[PDB]
């Protein structure tokens, strides 16, 4: 009666009546039972066998491999994001910079990357054309086919069709780190590992990923929850060849029985499923609180403009030298809550996009973009107080980077017009690393003045980084892409300008005219 157990049996039936199992398996049979043979003495004569079947409404790819060592073939290859032997750099994460693959399967994939690289482009085009692609394999053949599928999942946009990998009694492929990377992920949904109910797998290092079709004489169950799959299939290495022709036949009968799966396991799936649903709903309701926190931060910022320091500076100053309570609440209540929230948003939606067409839906994408421009400067202020350097290229928290990339991608497609006479008092600077540029230039100015024994060559680089920054500043003013608040008396930008005036020289500077004449006092105001 559990909505999970119901869904599992109904989904198993769906897969079976699919015909995906009969398609895949009959092609696998053809590798070793060729349909057409010729007996010409002339035409007749360990590694990877493979065959492409370009059918009419799909392209199927079978991989096959030599039968596996049973007593001790566990072997593990470690793949680090910075390793160049790594074919799956895109799979790695900040929490998961490395993972491990069963080494026979891995080496079998690598050897064959040649001549199948070509295949990869076609398949992607095939998918791009809206034509399905299945990739399949028995045993270590399935292991290799799964590695190949992963190889095809480099770019996941919610709008690109995705390959389906179907496996038959394969061994495990990834470790616990691969599992974590793939969990609850669109990638994870590309793999169906058909296994027999009586099959057992030793699972002390290799861990299940993807969906599992667990087959009984009475029928099958589609299980997506990986701890349930561990529960049902972990034993002590008790493999037995399973003729999957026989399994497919018995599924076909469907004349399923009661209690295919133990109750406790079902309960667990249901519990974890419902926690996940509630977590999703919570993210949606908690967005409203985050917008309210943003509203408090709006009022902080206006007050900081009124006092002529600016919010970033006030945040920085007050963090270094605490003296007022409001600021401590801004930082430890609202900014903190906002950071946990939006980090979690990004980490979730790059696993499971939010709609057919979008990684992030408009409420999330748009208010995430506002959150970026508003609150990344505070994280920059913290970053520079800590004495860290080079924020843009070495320091950005990932979630800010994703929110920027996604908003840019969508912005390409948005009809908008900026009015050249709008008051910009409330503009949120588009380059949310702007303050990092200010702080870096301050640092270089200190290096110029305070460093003695500096070589001439370095000084020139420093000076041109200086003129570079000046050009960046002038372009963002010209293009009306900075908040007028950078010009407040007490801000770090005005500090930068004071220090720089002394160092700079003899060049056209539309910036210095602009500053010297005070026209910055009119930047962003009209009538």
């Amino acid at each position: 009666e559990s909505s999970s157990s119901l869904k599992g049996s109904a989904l198993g039936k769906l897969v079976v009546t699919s015909g995906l199992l009969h398609s895949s398996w009959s092609k696998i049979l053809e590798i070793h039972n060729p349909p057409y043979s010729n007996h010409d003495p002339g035409l007749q004569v360990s590694g990877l066998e493979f065959q492409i079947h370009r059918e009419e409404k799909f392209t199927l790819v079978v991989f096959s491999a030599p039968p596996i060592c049973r007593s001790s073939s566990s072997d593990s290859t470690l793949l680090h994001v910075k390793d160049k032997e790594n074919p799956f750099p895109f799979l790695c994460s900040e929490n998961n910079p490395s993972f491990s693959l069963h080494t026979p399967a891995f080496n079998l994939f690598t050897s064959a990357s040649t001549s199948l690289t070509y295949l990869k482009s076609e398949l992607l085009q095939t998918l791009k054309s809206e034509k399905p692609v299945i990739i399949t394999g028995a045993a270590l053949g399935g292991s290799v086919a799964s590695l190949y599928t992963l190889w095809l999942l480099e770019t996941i946009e919610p709008t690109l069709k995705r390959p389906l990998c179907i496996t038959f009694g394969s061994p495990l492929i990834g470790d616990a780190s691969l599992q974590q990377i793939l969990e609850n992920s669109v990638r994870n949904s590309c793999f169906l590992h058909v296994v027999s109910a009586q099959t057992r797998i030793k699972m002390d290092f290799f861990k299940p990923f993807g969906t599992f079709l667990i087959c009984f004489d009475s029928g099958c169950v589609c299980i997506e929850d990986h701890v349930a799959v561990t529960e049902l299939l972990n034993g002590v290495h008790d493999s037995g060849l399973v003729d999957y022709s026989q399994v497919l036949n018995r599924l076909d009968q469907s004349m399923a029985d009661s209690r295919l799966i133990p109750e406790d396991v079902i309960k667990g799936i249901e519990k974890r499923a419902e926690m996940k649903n509630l977590r999703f709903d919570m993210m949606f309701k908690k967005l409203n609180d985050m917008k309210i926190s943003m509203a408090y931060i709006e009022w902080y910022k206006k007050k900081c403009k009124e006092v002529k320091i600016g919010y970033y500076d006030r945040f920085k100053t007050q963090l270094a030298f605490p003296s007022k309570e409001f600021d401590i609440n801004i930082k430890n209540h609202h900014k903190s809550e906002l950071n946990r929230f939006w980090k979690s948003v990004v980490e979730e939606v790059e696993r499971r996009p939010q709609s057919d067409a979008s990684i992030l839906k408009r409420r999330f994408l748009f208010s995430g973009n506002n959150y970026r421009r508003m609150i990344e400067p505070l994280d920059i202020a913290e970053y520079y107080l800590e004495g860290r350097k080079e924020y843009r290229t070495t320091g950005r928290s990932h979630h800010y980077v994703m929110l920027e990339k996604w908003f840019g991608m969508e912005s390409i497609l948005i009809e908008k017009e900026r009015c050249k006479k709008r008051d910009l008092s409330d503009l949120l600077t588009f380059d949310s690393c702007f303050w990092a540029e200010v702080e870096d230039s301050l640092i270089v100015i200190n290096q110029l003045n305070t460093t003695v024994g500096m070589r001439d060559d370095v000084r020139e680089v420093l000076t041109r980084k200086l003129v570079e920054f000046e050009g960046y500043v002038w372009e963002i003013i010209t293009k009306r892409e900075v908040s007028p608040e950078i010009f407040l008396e007490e801000s770090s930008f005005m500090k930068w300008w004071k220090e720089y005036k002394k160092i700079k020289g003899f060049n056209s500077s539309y910036l210095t005219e602009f500053m010297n004449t005070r026209k910055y006092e009119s930047y962003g105001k009209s009538q």
């Binding site: 509630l278 919570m282 309701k285 908690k286 309210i292 009022w299 902080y300 007050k303 030298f321 605490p322 003296s323 007022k324 309570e325 409001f326 600021d327 401590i328 609440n329 430890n332 209540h333 903190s336 809550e337 946990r340």
Partner: protein, 412 residues
């Protein structure tokens, strides 16, 4: 001025206009945490002070502004601000001036020292200098060098030190204030004021309340001062320096500790856990406090434990399960609080848990044991308790929603 400044003062009952007159010991547009005024009023008026503060509010002699839940009923007043219009405050200052034409006979003496220019009465030749005042306030500025005169202050029951300096040495004539019941020291300066000569407080036999605001002190060294009659200690927005001889029967009267906004506090001093007489311990808005020592279980008579809005406090000491007398556990604001103590259910006198934003807090199985329990929380946090309820004897879930306003901006 207004027809209801002079007239609402002229109608005032005795106690209310004395309180109004107390308001003259605060600075212009000071943001007064109500705790300050309650402490001050405590000696003369007991528990009626919040009543008096509300009375003065409702007849428009002062303004009250809540900056949080403000459940004043529990006895916490850190979440209410008091402001007074500077016209009313100047009126009060001049009422205090006209109560006596002799500064030596005045009941309320408000002394002010700018650029180290002491008033002429302080420099008088015919020592001894003896003042009659009951309420004594001293405002010094940021260039003040703490070069005090000598005087006797036999009648002072309440002292308000308004300080703006990086360094401040308490004046030795405090040691003559045998009748002192309350000491309030608030720093209005940018930098935490480093206090010295706190030992002038050591032998004041009636000293029951101390409140420090935005000063720098050794919290660790507080028991070395004796303070044998102290009933409440409050530290607000104060910087703590790590670190004189231990004393016998330290803080034997200590009954309530409040610590708020102490941003570089990273561990409770051990001596706080060893104050057997302690009834209430409140730590709020201390954002570097990661842990609370488990020695707090030693606090036998504790009835209220407030560990609240501490951004970094991820778990509670398990030994809370020894606080047999605990009535009230307040951990509201613990956005990152992950678990309640495992054996929380052992406590047979716990009547109320407040956890208004602890939406990442898991609930231990023991909570089912607690009976006749009120839980104050938000709806999200309310979710786990809604599930536990049917298994529980007379659980009350009170769902608090936030009241949004701009009042904390006053503290900007």
């Amino acid at each position: 001025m207004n027809s209801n400044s002079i007239q609402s003062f002229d109608a005032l009952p005795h106690n209310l206009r004395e309180c109004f007159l107390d308001m003259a010991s605060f600075l212009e547009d000071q943001r007064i945490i109500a705790s300050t005024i309650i402490d001050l009023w405590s000696a003369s008026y007991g528990k009626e002070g919040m009543n008096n503060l509300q009375d003065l509010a409702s007849r428009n002699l002062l303004k009250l502004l809540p900056i949080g839940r403000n459940e004043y009923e529990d006895g916490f007043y850190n979440e209410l601000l008091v402001k007074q219009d500077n016209v009313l405050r100047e009126f009060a200052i001049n009422q205090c001036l006209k109560e006596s034409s002799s500064i030596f006979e005045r009941k309320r003496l408000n002394l002010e020292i700018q650029d180290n220019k002491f008033p002429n009465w302080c420099l008088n030749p015919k020592q001894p200098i003896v003042i009659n005042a009951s309420l004594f306030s001293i405002s010094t500025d940021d260039s003040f060098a703490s070069s005090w005169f000598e005087m006797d202050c036999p009648n002072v029951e309440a002292l308000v030190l308004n300080i703006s300096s990086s360094n401040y040495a308490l004046p030795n004539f405090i040691a003559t204030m045998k009748e002192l019941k309350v000491v309030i020291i608030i720093n209005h300066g940018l930098e935490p004021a480093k206090l010295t000569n706190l030992s002038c407080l050591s032998s004041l036999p009636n000293l029951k309340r101390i409140r420090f605001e935005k000063v720098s002190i050794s919290l660790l060294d507080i028991p070395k001062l004796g303070l044998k009659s102290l009933e409440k200690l409050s530290l607000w927005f104060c910087h703590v320096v790590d670190a004189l001889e231990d004393v016998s029967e330290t803080l034997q009267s200590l009954q309530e500790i409040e610590i708020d906004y102490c941003y570089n506090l990273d561990e409770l001093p051990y001596w706080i856990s060893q104050v057997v007489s302690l009834k209430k311990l409140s730590v709020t808005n201390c954002n570097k406090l990661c842990r609370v020592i488990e020695a707090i279980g030693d606090l036998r008579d504790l009835e209220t434990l407030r560990l609240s809005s501490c951004a970094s406090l991820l778990e509670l000491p398990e030994t809370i399960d020894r606080l047999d007398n605990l009535r009230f556990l307040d951990v509201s604001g613990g956005f990152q609080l992950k678990n309640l103590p495992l054996e929380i259910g052992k406590l047979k006198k716990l009547e109320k848990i407040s956890m208004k934003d602890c939406y990442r807090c898991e609930l231990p199985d023991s909570v089912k044991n607690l009976e006749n329990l009120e839980v104050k929380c938000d709806e999200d946090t309310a979710f786990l308790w809604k599930i536990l309820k049917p298994e529980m004897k007379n659980l009350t879930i009170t769902e608090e929603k936030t009241e949004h306003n701009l009042n904390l901006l006053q503290l900007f």
